[PDB]
Amino acid sequence: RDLNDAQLKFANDVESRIQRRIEAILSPIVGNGNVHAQVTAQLDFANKEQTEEHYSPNGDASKATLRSRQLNISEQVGAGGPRSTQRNETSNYEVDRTIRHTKMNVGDIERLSVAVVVNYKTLADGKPLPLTADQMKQIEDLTREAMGFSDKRGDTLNVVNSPFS
Amino acid sequence: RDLNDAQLKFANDVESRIQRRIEAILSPIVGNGNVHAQVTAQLDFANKEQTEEHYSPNGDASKATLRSRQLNISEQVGAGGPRSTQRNETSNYEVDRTIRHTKMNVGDIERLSVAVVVNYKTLADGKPLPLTADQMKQIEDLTREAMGFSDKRGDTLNVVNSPFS
Amino acid sequence: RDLNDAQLKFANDVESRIQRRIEAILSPIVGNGNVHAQVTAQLDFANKEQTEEHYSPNGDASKATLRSRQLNISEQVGAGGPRSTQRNETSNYEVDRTIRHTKMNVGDIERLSVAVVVNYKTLADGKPLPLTADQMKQIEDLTREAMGFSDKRGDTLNVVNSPFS
């Protein structure tokens, strides 16, 4: 089981780099040792390939390309009446064509979850007090930008403020 | 039975890493030695392959691509009446096509279950008392983010608060 | 897992170069050590190929090229009346054609996120005060130009002003 052992080490490095990035950005604002963050990562390890072929529509006559055409009219009016109208048409077309071949990578990030806790000092000498809502929102925005939120990917973030021991 | 012996070791490492992650995040809030967590993991070890082929629909004329077409009208009005309308049409199309080949990985996580117990101190010198509902909710959210909840996957979490010995 | 280890190092260099560029441009305005910035990057590592083939339309007669043509009129007026008009036409065309083959690069930037924090001095000796809106807008514009905003790509920027410790 050598493959699984190496895979676990790779996932540890991804989380380690993100963890210290959040610590570094928030360290000056709150303090050197008043922030803690833990990051868990889910990685895709499957091998995938994809081939796509697309054709541009040519229903409209203005945007159509023709290689050959045949077109015959027959029309006989009779009096003394009959009207034997007749029409035949054959058309050949040259169409646009696009092909993309994609071989995806192994080790991408599928989803991330980060939890951050901050301390209660709030004062030089008085009793600890909760932080302001605006400051909490600023901290949330900064850690969100640091970690790389993507709503469509499915990221989750949770930050709580509580006293330390 | 060398394969099964190595498989058991791999499952132990996955649970070990998750266990200390929950301990580290919750250690400052409650204390150094006032938290205990145990993690059990179910791993998929089957070999799977999959091939998918998809075609884009072309029922609508506006989004259709044509290589050739034949179309003949015949229409004879007679008087003295008969109306022998006739129509023939033959069409050929060029269709989009996409192929993905996927070879899945061995050793993924199918489901996780974690149980966490926290202590009763609640006071410097008085008798132990239960923790607050808000603090319990914060602890639950933090451990959920640390462990990586996924509702569709089937994860289960249970946290209880009780005295220690 | 040697490929993933090297990939992580490459992403670190991209963020490192951008980080010091923002620091250098904003250093004289605010101060030597009154600015902090952290950059996270998402890189595409997939292998992709694409082939495109396009044909210019030739529906209009003025912009059409002909290699051969056949065209026969028959028209019989009878009196004592019948009018047996008849028309046949066959046309061949020479069409324009363009082919581009593209092999994309590996390691491009898909999206960037930067968070910047600035300090409160605002005075030589008095209490710290918030910076002006115009100065904040100037700082935002300068860091945006330094980092390389692209609206269609999906870039995100967040700058907040708060006291330091």
Residue numbers in the entry:
A (entry chain A), B (entry chain B), C (entry chain HA): 228 to 307, 354 to 438
From the paper:
A central part of the bacterial flagellar motor is the MS-ring, which is composed entirely of multiple copies of the FliF subunit. Major functions of this ring are to support the assembly of the switch and to stabilize the assembled motor. Starting at the N-terminus, each FliF protomer begins with a predicted transmembrane helix, TM1, followed by a set of domains termed ring-building motifs (RBMs). From the N-terminus, these include RBM1, RBM2, and RBM3, with RBM3 further divided into RBM3a, a ß-collar, and RBM3b.
MS-rings containing 33 subunits represented ~80% of the population (49,944 particles). The 3D map of the 33-mer RBM3 had an average resolution of 2.9 Å, with local resolutions between 2.6 Å and 3.4 Å. We therefore built an atomic model into this map. At a global level, each RBM3 appeared to exhibit the same fold as previous models. However, an overlay of our structure with that reported by Johnson et al resulted in an RMS deviation of 1.2 Å, which is greater than would be expected for two structures of identical sequence at ~3 Å resolution. We therefore evaluated whether the RMS deviation could be artificially high because of a difference in angle between the β-collar and RBM3. As a minor note, residues 395–401 of RBM3 in the 33-mer were associated with clear density but were not included in the previously published models. The correlation of these densities with the stabilization of RBM3 residues 395–401 potentially suggests an architecture with discrete membrane-spanning domains.
